[PDB]
Amino acid sequence: MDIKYDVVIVGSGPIGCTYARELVGAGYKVAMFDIGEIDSGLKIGAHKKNTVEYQKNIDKFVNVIQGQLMSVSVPVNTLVVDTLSPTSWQASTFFVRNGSNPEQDPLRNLSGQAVTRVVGGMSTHWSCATPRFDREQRPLLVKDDADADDAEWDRLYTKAESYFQTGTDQFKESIRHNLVLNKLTEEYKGQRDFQQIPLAATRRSPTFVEWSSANTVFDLQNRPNTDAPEERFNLFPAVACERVVRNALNSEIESLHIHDLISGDRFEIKADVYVLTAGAVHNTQLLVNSGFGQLGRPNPANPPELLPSLGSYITEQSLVFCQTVMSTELIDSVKSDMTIRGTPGELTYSVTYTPGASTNKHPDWWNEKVKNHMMQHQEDPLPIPFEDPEPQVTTLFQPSHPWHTQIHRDAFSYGAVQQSIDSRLIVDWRFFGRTEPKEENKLWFSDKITDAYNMPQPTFDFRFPAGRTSKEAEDMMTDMCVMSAKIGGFLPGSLPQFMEPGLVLHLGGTHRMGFDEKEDNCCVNTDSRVFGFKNLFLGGCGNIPTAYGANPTLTAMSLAIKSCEYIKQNFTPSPF
Amino acid sequence: MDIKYDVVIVGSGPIGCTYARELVGAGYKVAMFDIGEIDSGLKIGAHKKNTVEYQKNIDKFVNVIQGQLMSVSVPVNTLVVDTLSPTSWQASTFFVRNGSNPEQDPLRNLSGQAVTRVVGGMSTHWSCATPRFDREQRPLLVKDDADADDAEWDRLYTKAESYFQTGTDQFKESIRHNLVLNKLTEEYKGQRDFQQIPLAATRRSPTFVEWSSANTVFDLQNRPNTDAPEERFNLFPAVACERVVRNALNSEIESLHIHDLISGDRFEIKADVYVLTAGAVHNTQLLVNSGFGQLGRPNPANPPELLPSLGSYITEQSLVFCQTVMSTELIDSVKSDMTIRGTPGELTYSVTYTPGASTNKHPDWWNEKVKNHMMQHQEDPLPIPFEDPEPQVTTLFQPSHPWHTQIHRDAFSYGAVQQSIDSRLIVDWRFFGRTEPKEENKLWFSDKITDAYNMPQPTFDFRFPAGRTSKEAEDMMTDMCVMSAKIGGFLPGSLPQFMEPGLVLHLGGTHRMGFDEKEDNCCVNTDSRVFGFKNLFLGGCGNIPTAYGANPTLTAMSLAIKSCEYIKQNFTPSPF
Amino acid sequence: NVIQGQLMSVSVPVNTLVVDTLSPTSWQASTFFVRNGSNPEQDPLRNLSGQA
């Protein structure tokens, strides 16, 4: 440890990694701190699902994800356990047990909200969907010139797309994917258009996909190194960053207070530039622990000195979920171009097709795969090959259907634990609603209760806003029922449902961007700079100030890119 | 990738790491292959629990374990799903889905048996309990001289405990440890002896324990390297080892066929010496895949050419489990030495004790921690400090109580604790029985069904033998019920039960050790060398041929140390 | 089933289960109010919950 750097970044998620990639690239002397540790393998902050073993038993990855999702606010438990033996110690009240938060109203929570403390953050487990927002979902970066605003967003997203290696091709030879894609495409007759979900991934072989992650944006190795002899970067894992120190006029940050979790020691790290990328919840915790916003249960009577919008206007998407079992009609269509004779399991059985025939419903590569599966595996009653990659279908958000869709299979902290229905038949349905930012929806911090790292305990006061948010969420549920039925019936055990609020982990707005602090009720400008402070920047979904349905990380990356432009324009890196 | 080494080890679990530490240290050019990958952090093959965030969120580690336990043999599923939509594809038979094994009788399974494929193997997640076996549990290493046999086993165990860093004091200043330790010592005074579980672990601070793993045995760094400039070792993860190539005469291994899972390429690796440490299941798979024992369903009309006892006489332990809620009486005694004035919350609440007082029931270190807790947390109704380390108590196997016991808390694939009862109150009880080896209990491999790595699918034909094994298992359940009652009543939701067969993961006997192949119905001699073959050795629980109740790894490590002593004497390292 | 059909619980405390997966359009409680014949006098931790 140096005590002095050009830039310090808190958190080694994919958004901290954007700031590192831009600024280490540009010659700045950079340090990054993470409260979490390198576990992930020799590629630091890489995607934990890039093992052969995981992609051969993908269902087990759900557990890995649950293992690193730590709930943000758990209300005090009031379950009645009245069958303890009379000799066992028995409680008289629902007292504060097992890390629970007595500030939390159980009926106004984001009970599903959780955080991950490891190097690379949530990008070590995420499902890698990186779509662009359309205008209706996107903050403005220029007003009163939509063409200029469009050109800015296109440049930034394009760059963000390179950093993540976003693509729409990785699943193009999957039979399940094309079976679902083509059917929805036919059914909607141009009313909606379908495509592959844009994924941050590169395919390495037919049975393996290198999913992207932080490591993809920046490899997190210390520099200088032989591969980058003129760059300067140090990562410090197991370091809780607790507060930034403000000067007296509140126009500059003077240091970052840290706590080394292994030695126990504390330090004050000095930098020219301080970047907070600790996630939407923890950025806000760190600012409020620093004297920004208001500590404790909200109280209009003593309105804060600084950032009165911090932790208000928060948004989290509604999420509806089901699983379907492929229709007979679609399964039989897999084999539409085949001539099948005799009885499976006899030497006289055969399966053929005519290559190139203009009337075939499917291409040759598909019929080849089907033929070989059905000829080599005559004991199997399905025409889909055993290792056919998953579907990855979306029709993106549009004003007349204002929700994102994913019609796919991926690993999440829920999603079928079942064995009785063949996995080749099962398609997941996830529709994501947009939520209006409302002042009364808040993330705040207890002035009494603390979390496991002795910081102010986060507390939500959240409900989906009535009016348009709620009308679309229900219309969205209906849309998913109507759409999914074109492909098949619901899988028993995964019937259509709203999921636990915040499970979807797309919280935004906690330290929101806009042009004017007051008129826009916001915390950072379009450079991601905290209002008032020359040298403090926030990055993450917490910046997004709009109601969005699409998955937000790519948009948050784009914002961080723009932020790094302003930093190059106003700070000089130290000589090497 | 040299094509030639002095020694090749298949398997990077603790036992393979024993051969490595011994043979790399003695100057052999050693290569090690593992089908799985470095994930675990920069300490290769280290315990995954050793993170600050896991040890602050220890209930989450259960998910990590679940995520890397892949079931060995899952029988064909016969659950009825009769609530599909009539449009959905629906089965006509219970056909083979999702990885199930049609050879498996579901009533003669070890359905809880599971394998872990990652660098370090199961040692990246185990709960670190390493006791010694008494004579009753233990194979003989010296014939006709009980005292020389004990001398040899003491020398081996001593070395193996040093490699694991085994100890019996890391939990000595736990209040809950001592609370239970003391009560049971007193209840069984003159009848049974209680102590701490011998644990491969080193305490680093009052709230942090460095659990041991394969990494403790050997750090798995490629050599030569700065701190060992003269040693030669290379680790190759993501390599499936598939066959050892027998010479026509069956007197020697000529090479190791491997499949690099990243490139897809297959290779023959050459060594002087071949060591299989792939675990009890997968060592056996590999051998049967190489022509040893008999491929397919057992058919005694066909004695196999080699190792007719391979995959017979398998043993797995009966495992009984419950959890308890500490008695009111015990919880009160925790604060027995305390002088209390007024009540909590009120102005003059004070809690004090007199160190050294002869009327004190507890030591000063206990009282100090209780006093401080009760004074610093007057809202909490219990006297146990929040970060009190876990309890870790055992009464070891004896003739009059022939089962191992563990009266503790730790993370397993089951037994995750709920949220309504305070965790400070909860104690886990696991009692492990011993299983008589019997020729009819078998692990065998399909001649046609293959697993996810296209190797012969493992199938169990297993039942707990009638007689002593069965009577003892039931007596063991009653003992748990009687012993647990001294400490507290059963926790609702963790009532006393037998756990699913094999969930215990202490599988033994699959490639069992003895003096004479024929007379003792075994596969390896006491040097762990395969009968007939000059240069093939097996390591692991599968070598153990007795009925044992205590946890096996430490015993397996001892036999490997003995195995290395043979190898050192009989093969010469190549020149550096 | 017949027995269950004629055993009517004597005292049911106020329900404090959290149902947070209702549709946003559905009417949602702000409190754990007296619902369905529950008894608000009853301390759920000092009951004979099974008396009928």
Add this chain to the structure above:
Amino acid sequence: VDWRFFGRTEPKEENKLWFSDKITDAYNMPQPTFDFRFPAGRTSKEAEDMMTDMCVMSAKIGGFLPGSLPQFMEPGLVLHLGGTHRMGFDEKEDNCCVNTDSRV
């Protein structure tokens, strides 16, 4: 085979059945409320020892049926409630409501 073991409970003043003066039942009569815990002391010790006896005795006949593991039943489900209007010789001395002819 079903195993049911039934323990005795010491009569204590503080264990009560009472009636709300506001809340009413389905028949518009005052809502019954309990305030009960198994008494500390002999009741509780006996109850636990009783669970142990069942685990010990039952084992002579057979193992537990999975899904019917030994447990304490939700309080009152046994339906053997007593002493709500208790008998004794003398109302004050024996803390009671009826004499031994069951007259109030």
